Amino acid sequence: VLYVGSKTKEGVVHDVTTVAAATKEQVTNVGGAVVTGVTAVAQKTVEGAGSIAAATGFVKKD
Amino acid sequence: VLYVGSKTKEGVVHDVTTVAAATKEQVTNVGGAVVTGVTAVAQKTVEGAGSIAAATGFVKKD
Amino acid sequence: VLYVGSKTKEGVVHDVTTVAAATKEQVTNVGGAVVTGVTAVAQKTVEGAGSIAAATGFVKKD
Amino acid sequence: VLYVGSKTKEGVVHDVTTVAAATKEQVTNVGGAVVTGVTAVAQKTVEGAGSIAAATGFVKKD
Amino acid sequence: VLYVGSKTKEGVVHDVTTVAAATKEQVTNVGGAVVTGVTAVAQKTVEGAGSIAAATGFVKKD
Amino acid sequence: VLYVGSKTKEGVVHDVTTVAAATKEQVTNVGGAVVTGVTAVAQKTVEGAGSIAAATGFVKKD
């Protein structure tokens, strides 16, 4: 292996923009999850049994 | 293997734009999940039994 | 292995922008989670059984 | 005017590649010009009388 | 005018690659110019009479 | 005018790579110019009469 003048990108997020304006919002939540905003996860490795990687608004009522 | 002047991208998200405006919103949630916003997951590897990678608004009522 | 004049990026988030304006918001939460803001996770490795890496608004009612 | 999450490119050159190999070359030059290599000019504005912008192998024997 | 999360590029050169190999070369030059290598010019503005912007191997025998 | 989370690039050169190998070269020069190597000019403004901006291997035998 050998890289010359190169570039690598494994697991990236970029140039995420968000322009809200004049935003009203009501959220009545009970017990569950509410997610009303920008999100971004950047991981290289996740291993192992039962793994729950990069959840969002997760509810596990086992 | 050898890369010269190259570029790699494994598992990426980019140039995500979002222009809301004059947005009213009501959300009455009970028990379950609600997801009302931009999202982006960037992973390279996920392994193992039972794995639940990059969920969103997940509800596991086992 | 050998890199010359190169660049690597494993598990990164960048150039995350967020322009709110004139934002009203009410959130009545009981028991569950509410996430109403920008987020970003940057990890290289996560291992092991049962692992729950990079949750958000997680609720585990086991 | 207003740009959101945009990109502009005025007068650009990019991704110029060149793979020579086992190249012999003789060049006997007298008085004139010889150009035997990759070239690229990037300008936004050039004005004025008599202007000679981005010449290559130019010979002006006025 | 107003840019949000944007990008501009006026007069740029990039990602110029050059891979020579096993290259013999003889150049016998007298009086004139010889240019046997990668080149790149990046300007935004050039004004005025008689201007000679970004020449290469130029010979002005006025 | 106003930029938010933005990026500008006026007159730039970047990511210039050059991989020579096993290169023999003879250059017998008399009076004129010889240019056998990578080059890059980065200017924002050049003004005025008679201007000669970013020459290379120039020979002015007026």
Side-chain angles (χ1 to χ4, degrees):
Chain A
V1 191
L2 70 95
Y3 296 140
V4 187
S6 80
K7 293 174 184 179
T8 312
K9 277 193 180 183
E10 323 187 8
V12 313
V13 185
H14 63 83
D15 271 295
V16 176
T17 311
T18 299
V19 186
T23 295
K24 182 157 179 178
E25 163 173 350
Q26 321 196 6
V27 172
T28 308
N29 173 83
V30 186
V34 167
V35 192
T36 318
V38 194
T39 310
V41 179
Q43 318 166 353
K44 165 168 172 166
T45 310
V46 160
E47 308 168 341
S51 313
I52 305 186
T56 297
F58 198 98
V59 169
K60 196 161 172 172
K61 290 203 188 308
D62 177 50
Chain B
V1 191
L2 70 95
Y3 296 140
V4 187
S6 80
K7 293 174 184 179
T8 312
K9 277 193 180 183
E10 323 187 8
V12 313
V13 185
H14 63 83
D15 271 295
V16 176
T17 310
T18 299
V19 186
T23 295
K24 182 157 179 178
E25 163 173 350
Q26 321 196 6
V27 172
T28 308
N29 173 83
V30 186
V34 167
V35 192
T36 317
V38 194
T39 310
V41 179
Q43 318 166 353
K44 165 168 172 166
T45 310
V46 160
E47 308 168 341
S51 313
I52 305 186
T56 297
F58 198 98
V59 169
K60 196 161 172 172
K61 290 203 188 308
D62 177 50
Chain C
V1 191
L2 70 95
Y3 296 140
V4 187
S6 80
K7 293 174 184 179
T8 312
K9 277 193 180 183
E10 323 187 8
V12 313
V13 185
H14 63 83
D15 271 295
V16 176
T17 311
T18 299
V19 186
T23 295
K24 182 157 179 178
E25 163 173 350
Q26 321 196 6
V27 172
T28 308
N29 173 84
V30 186
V34 167
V35 192
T36 318
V38 194
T39 310
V41 179
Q43 318 166 353
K44 165 168 172 166
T45 310
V46 160
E47 308 168 341
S51 313
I52 305 186
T56 297
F58 198 98
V59 169
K60 196 161 172 172
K61 290 203 188 308
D62 177 50
Chain D
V1 191
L2 70 95
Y3 296 140
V4 187
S6 80
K7 293 174 184 179
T8 312
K9 277 193 180 183
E10 323 187 8
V12 313
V13 185
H14 63 83
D15 271 295
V16 177
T17 310
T18 299
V19 186
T23 295
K24 182 157 179 178
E25 163 173 350
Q26 321 196 6
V27 172
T28 308
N29 173 83
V30 186
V34 167
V35 192
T36 318
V38 194
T39 310
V41 179
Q43 318 166 353
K44 165 168 172 166
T45 310
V46 160
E47 308 168 341
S51 313
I52 305 186
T56 297
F58 198 98
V59 169
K60 196 161 172 172
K61 290 203 188 308
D62 177 50
Chain E
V1 191
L2 70 95
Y3 296 140
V4 187
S6 80
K7 293 174 184 179
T8 312
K9 277 193 180 183
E10 323 187 8
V12 313
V13 185
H14 63 83
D15 271 295
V16 176
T17 311
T18 299
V19 186
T23 295
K24 182 157 179 178
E25 163 173 350
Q26 321 196 6
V27 172
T28 308
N29 173 83
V30 186
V34 167
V35 192
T36 318
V38 194
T39 310
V41 179
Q43 318 166 353
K44 165 168 172 166
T45 310
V46 160
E47 308 168 341
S51 313
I52 305 186
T56 297
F58 198 98
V59 169
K60 196 161 172 172
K61 290 203 188 308
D62 177 50
Chain F
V1 191
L2 70 95
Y3 296 140
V4 187
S6 80
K7 293 174 184 179
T8 312
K9 277 193 180 183
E10 323 187 8
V12 313
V13 185
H14 63 83
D15 271 295
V16 176
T17 311
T18 299
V19 186
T23 295
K24 182 157 179 178
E25 163 173 350
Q26 321 196 6
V27 172
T28 308
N29 173 84
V30 186
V34 167
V35 192
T36 318
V38 194
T39 310
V41 179
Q43 318 166 353
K44 165 168 172 166
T45 310
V46 160
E47 308 168 341
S51 313
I52 305 186
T56 297
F58 198 98
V59 169
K60 196 161 172 172
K61 290 203 188 308
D62 177 50

